[PDB]
Write a protein that binds this ligand. Structure first.
Ligand SMILES: [Cu+2]
Ligand SMILES: [Cu+2]
Lengths: 118, 114
């Protein structure tokens, strides 16, 4: 594939609204997307106050790192709170979701294998 | 599901012919990862990862500080909030010319180990 290196301010990407049956109040920046990624993609999610990614599962993993704020993680059985500086590994097919129960935006990095899209 | 404070993962001091003044935390490693691994590097003041290359990419996010990125020729300094995509085989390295620790997240495909 191509050579080189990209160095870019993540906020130079405009956060795009995500709106699905399960997702409301969330925006996403694609940092390293399908047009460039050899194996896996890097996105930066912003969860607005009250925003929700309701419980779901899918046949690929997540690797997440929380950049800003206090995030509620929805699990099969209950919920748990994380904050800036936490990482999360979600196994393939594990039930998960996210909610922002605070007044300010939450941001996290989210990487998935590229077979799961961007 | 694993939910953990990255700080609580024990850092490893890296010391090689190319690397000095660097610590590495393996957050999501080979025992867990289906496809790619997540590490968190801390570069001490004056720390250096000298130019190298390998047949896998990096996907990096700068968490703290001003990171000097070494390129095949020359260098570029970036700061917290930058991401870095290093294509496979591209020469790269890192240095911290500042007086405080620099941290960055670094993900590689599992073929690169952890
Ligand atoms: Cu998911
Ligand atoms: Cu490297």
């Amino acid at each position: 594939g191509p050579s080189g290196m990209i160095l870019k301010r993540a906020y130079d990407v405009t956060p795009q609204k995500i709106s699905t049956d399960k997702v409301r109040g969330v925006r996403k920046r694609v940092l390293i997307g399908l047009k460039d990624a050899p194996n896996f993609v890097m996105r930066l999610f912003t969860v607005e106050p009250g925003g929700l990614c309701d419980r779901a599962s899918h046949p690929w993993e997540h690797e997440i790192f929380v950049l800003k704020g206090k995030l509620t993680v929805l699990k099969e059985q209950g919920e748990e709170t994380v904050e800036e500086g936490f990482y999360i590994f979600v196994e393939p097919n594990e039930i998960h979701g996210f909610r922002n129960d605070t007044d300010s935006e939450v941001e996290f990095l989210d990487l998935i294998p590229k077979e799961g899209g961007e």
